[PDB]
Amino acid sequence: LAPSVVTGVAQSSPLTIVTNPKEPRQPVPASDGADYLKTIPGFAVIRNGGSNGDPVLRGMFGSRLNILTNGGMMLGAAPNRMDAPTSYISPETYDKLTVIKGPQTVLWGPGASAGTILFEREPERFGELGSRVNASLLAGSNGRFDKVLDAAAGNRLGYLRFTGNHAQSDDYEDGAGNTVPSRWKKWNGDVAVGWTPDEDTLIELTAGKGDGEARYAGRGMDGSQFKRESLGLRFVKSNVSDVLEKVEAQVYYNYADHIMDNFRLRTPDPSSMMPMPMASQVDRRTLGGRLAATWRWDDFKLVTGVDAMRNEHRARGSKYDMMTDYYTDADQFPWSKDAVFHNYGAFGELTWFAAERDRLIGGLRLDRASVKDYRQTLKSGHMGHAMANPTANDTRADTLPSGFVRYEHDLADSPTTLYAGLGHAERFPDYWELFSPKRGPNGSVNAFDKIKPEKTTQLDFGLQYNGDKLQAWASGYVGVVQDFILFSYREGMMGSSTQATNVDARIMGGELGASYQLTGNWKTDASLAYAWGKNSSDDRALPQIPPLEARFGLTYEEGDWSAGSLWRVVAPQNRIARDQGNVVGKDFDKSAGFGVFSLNGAYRVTRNVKLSAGVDNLFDKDYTEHLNKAGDAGFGFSANETVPEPGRTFWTKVDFSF
């Protein structure tokens, strides 16, 4: 019962990780969802500034990751992904984080090539009329202050629930004394109302707001606004038949609305290629639903259902005269839509419990994707002037089936689980892969016309050992990607032009981890994570693969309190692909290895108050991540200087639970 800071999360069961984002985490995460994933082996992060990192699982970027919140999906608006989905998630607000690695689930939506992230809140319950409350404050170096509250009242027939947080920080400093332009402010409030009429029935209505601002050292504009609006409807019935155990239905609505500019949290670089005040506003309305039914009878959990989703993207930009200098903010201009996506899908997952020691799992899902392009002009050609868009009002669609099989077997002599699975997923191109790139495949018309689906076939395997003093897990993958979508960077006159192409790719890698209890007070654990990719069409390494890394943990415990140290050692990355990558980042230089040491402690003062603290990067190491963005140069960054990581930082947090 001794409290503990979190430095790592193991695999609880084959391919799957389950954590709780409300326990304190030693490399003190910001307030994005990408940072609460850094403590899970397999995850890297592109750094843009101080918060809102872009997550990378086993080397894979972007929409290859299925990031949902309470079952529904929230999507960004910025065409360069300055407002990636995780920017709108504050994990502190959620009770459970689940990750399934690989292409091994069909229940949560199409095209989960690399893996599935599941932030959720869990329904209340009340033996009778009662009321519970959770709160926490965090204070740290560089103006770090995070408050979070979750409160709930109810009786055995219903409940009200409120969660919310406020968090902000100033610029941090690296291990070399410099200020990194990277402040942020976020807040979120959400309300639920839930009706439990009899014990086998629940309805829930959900609403929430959020806003945020962020300073980006690794972009040419800052995030002035991350306004979010959300409505949800959830309905479950249990024990419908005696072989239809559960039926669930869910509607969700997720409106993102984001402003990028260069004049609110910075001033325009006078030497830049946008030295005037620019601002560009973008929103993204998402509607989606899910209807699933669970049947269990004999040895068969079989979950069958359907889902469907529609999202709509719009934009408008600032107009700034130059000898009038009459700037006119973008919100005195009409909203100009350019994209509407639809997905309709149907899915099923069958599990077979053969014998005490064997399980066999099998999924399929057929999806029906489509997109319409409502751009009338495109700003290409000479100095980027209006040109009639050749795919204007066009509508492409595809029918993409996916699925997996997995076999899990338990040894007879030992507490070992062994597991191997095959999985194949197809993924319809992203907003960012269809509209963002200046140019499409060679001889295209645009990128919308030619970028083909991405079809990934992957083999997953590993094991679980959880004996008495040893608990260990491992998990590898070998896979092929056909038509892997890949960006390419040229520079000419106006700036640096992207270009999307479809290549074939080989991927491999893995993660392992173990934890050993030496004595009653002494614990150690370690984790390793490695990823490897190749461009088969060009005999090149894949761009933006995170280097090999290992973490070592050692702790001391006395029941009321604990202390621990943590060492993070990271190999250099030598397989790069210069001027290739994704919509946010390009490879340029081989990265340096490095190591970072840290310390943490926690005290359970009373049954309702607990404290914890940490110093991070104890030796003020001056490092950078391979995947980090290059910095503005308007912030005085040289050549291809990536954004430095945070130097020595201290943090302290109290956890109130009445």
Side-chain angles (χ1 to χ4, degrees), residues 124-347:
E124 300 299 317
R125 199 129 66 267
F126 289 99
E128 200 198 326
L129 183 90
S131 167
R132 59 85 151 145
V133 55
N134 270 5
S136 99
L137 175 81
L138 181 120
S141 324
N142 325 303
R144 184 62 179 279
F145 213 63
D146 300 13
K147 23 204 177 204
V148 48
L149 161 80
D150 158 68
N155 46 36
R156 95 167 82 264
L157 295 205
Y159 54 81
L160 291 58
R161 148 143 193 193
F162 166 79
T163 81
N165 61 336
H166 184 300
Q168 85 216 72
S169 147
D170 314 316
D171 322 289
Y172 67 87
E173 282 156 34
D174 52 2
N178 321 269
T179 308
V180 176
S182 75
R183 61 186 258 192
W184 47 274
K185 222 166 191 178
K186 299 163 66 112
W187 64 264
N188 293 270
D190 288 277
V191 55
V193 277
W195 177 327
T196 166
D198 86 90
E199 287 52 90
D200 291 314
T201 322
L202 175 157
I203 301 119
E204 173 151 277
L205 208 33
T206 87
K209 306 210 156 201
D211 205 344
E213 59 191 33
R215 188 134 94 199
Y216 293 139
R219 311 258 183 167
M221 281 189 294
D222 319 284
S224 282
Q225 179 202 294
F226 291 78
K227 187 105 223 313
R228 156 192 82 92
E229 304 189 18
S230 311
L231 304 151
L233 253 200
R234 322 177 31 99
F235 169 82
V236 192
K237 192 155 252 153
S238 323
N239 280 124
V240 182
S241 148
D242 66 312
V243 296
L244 164 53
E245 222 142 54
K246 188 203 300 143
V247 176
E248 332 164 32
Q250 159 142 52
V251 186
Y252 64 78
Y253 170 86
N254 279 334
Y255 182 56
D257 178 16
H258 165 71
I259 294 164
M260 344 173 278
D261 56 62
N262 71 341
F263 61 80
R264 272 182 234 287
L265 319 173
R266 81 171 68 181
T267 52
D269 172 12
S271 270
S272 41
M273 278 56 190
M274 50 178 272
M276 62 294 211
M278 286 194 49
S280 149
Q281 199 185 10
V282 287
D283 65 9
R284 182 106 162 214
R285 223 173 297 263
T286 303
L287 180 73
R290 174 151 192 283
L291 191 279
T294 304
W295 326 79
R296 180 179 332 171
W297 76 110
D298 262 36
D299 316 345
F300 294 89
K301 198 137 91 201
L302 169 75
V303 191
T304 68
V306 284
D307 55 68
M309 179 274 328
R310 174 178 203 151
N311 63 77
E312 169 188 19
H313 181 269
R314 309 183 290 153
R316 53 186 186 185
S318 100
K319 259 160 90 212
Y320 170 75
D321 200 306
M322 189 65 239
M323 49 212 183
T324 326
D325 300 300
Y326 190 76
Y327 172 91
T328 323
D329 201 61
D331 75 322
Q332 271 144 211
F333 289 118
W335 281 107
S336 157
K337 157 168 64 191
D338 48 69
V340 179
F341 280 81
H342 303 99
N343 171 80
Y344 308 97
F347 59 85

Side-chain angles (χ1 to χ4, degrees), residues 498-533:
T498 43
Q499 198 228 7
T501 59
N502 286 114
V503 302
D504 301 1
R506 300 177 259 244
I507 61 154
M508 63 182 96
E511 310 87 39
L512 56 141
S515 89
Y516 197 118
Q517 271 94 303
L518 306 119
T519 75
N521 320 60
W522 274 105
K523 180 240 81 199
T524 168
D525 44 25
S527 87
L528 193 127
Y530 170 56
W532 187 97

Side-chain angles (χ1 to χ4, degrees), residues 7 13 33 49 55 64 67 82 131 134 268 284 445 495 555 567 636:
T7 58
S13 51
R64 304 178 185 69
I67 298 177
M82 278 171 53
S131 167
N134 270 5
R284 182 106 162 214
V445 201
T555 51
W567 221 315

Side-chain angles (χ1 to χ4, degrees), residues 405-445:
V405 86
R406 158 171 77 258
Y407 175 48
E408 297 172 4
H409 169 66
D410 303 321
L411 302 189
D413 44 55
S414 147
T416 325
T417 295
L418 290 170
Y419 74 92
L422 194 39
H424 170 93
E426 332 206 322
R427 182 176 66 76
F428 203 78
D430 231 346
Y431 171 80
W432 298 275
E433 317 171 295
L434 291 181
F435 300 78
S436 312
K438 182 216 171 37
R439 309 143 43 214
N442 262 302
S444 75
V445 201

